[PDB]
Structure 1
């Protein structure tokens, strides 16, 4: 069940849900495993907010263990294409594609909760079939791994070699460690 909130305005009472009310304030939610259906929904919300006001910042809370890499790339392109700066805040956890999107936000506007955790790992795939087909798929996944590493180094500011070594295996970093690594900028502990 989704609670239905009511917003008081000059025109009159308006009916909205919990998610819709926050969306009107330029807020987006990224919950559940990343896939084509959910990823497309997020992209649509970003486009709508840009048309309404191409200057106000668009917030996006990332809380998911990850999902399809291809479905996650579409969201990244939309964030870097729309003129409004996308502010990403990590809530709960952000692993696999979630971590990549966390550092993809506009510089100086990346935040995370004090107890939030971010995990980064190399791309995961796999193909079965003839030898020739397996070779093509192996090259495809390798290319995606290199592109992802370059993008990560661009935001976090670390060297390309450092990112590759740290992505060889799952790496868990707490909120304080994320700031030093470069994934996020500051930590939102209490409202001031």
Structure 2
């Protein structure tokens, strides 16, 4: 898997947690430092993950002074699809038979009754942060993003272009 590092390809595989997010931004610090003109293509394949782990890789891609390219491989369930929509307009690619799922992220509330209400406000703040940023990436209204994110909704790659998740597909 070391041959992809010289071709400026990073791999987003499995559920995103703290040690994977530290390794993923470490590869992003090196690929922009060797060249600030060529893009970085990322193969996203994730079934979900933590709330703060997906937000730790979202902001560092916006700091890359050249654009990036995101290609869906197989499936992105409620955490990888947010990484797809945060890419550059005109560089969001996907497989023709892939799958895009948009859902609110998982997360628990362990502690006191005063503690579980003050930490659920952060989850309600995470829902306004995720749906607030996703509405600016797809160009749709604020109501339609908060309407379908409560339950799991799978999206075909053909209907993902008209909705605004991806920009094009690689058929060849």
TM-score, normalization by structure 1: 0.87
1:95 aligns with 2:101: no
CA contact (8 A) 2:45 2:72 kept: yes
State the distance in 1 between where 2:128 and 2:84 align. Answer: 19
Q: State the partner residue of 1:78.
A: 60
Q: State the partner residue of 2:8.
A: 26
Instruction: After TM superposition, list the pairs within 5 Å mapping 1:77-156 onto structure 2.
Output: 77-156=59-138
Give the gaps of 5 or more residues in structure 2: none
Query: How far is 1:74 from its partner?
Result: 1.0
CA contact (8 A) 2:51 2:107 kept: no
Between Structure 1 and Structure 2, the one with more strand by share is: 1
CA contact (8 A) 2:69 2:92 kept: yes
Query: How far is 1:51 from its partner?
Result: 0.5
Query: How far is 1:89 from its partner?
Result: 0.4
Query: How far is 1:126 from its partner?
Result: 2.2
Q: How many residue pairs get matched?
A: 172
Query: How far is 1:68 from its partner?
Result: 0.8
State the distance in 1 between where 2:51 and 2:160 align. Answer: 22
1:18-65 Cα shifts (integer Å, max 9, x gaps):
x22221111111011111111111111111010000110011110111
Radius of gyration: which is bigger? 1
State the distance in 2 between where 1:100 and 1:41 align. Answer: 19
Give the gaps of 5 or more residues in structure 1: 1-18
C-alpha RMSD of matched pairs (Å):
1.0
Deviation beyond 4 Å, 4+ runs, structure 1? none
TM-score, normalization by structure 2: 0.96
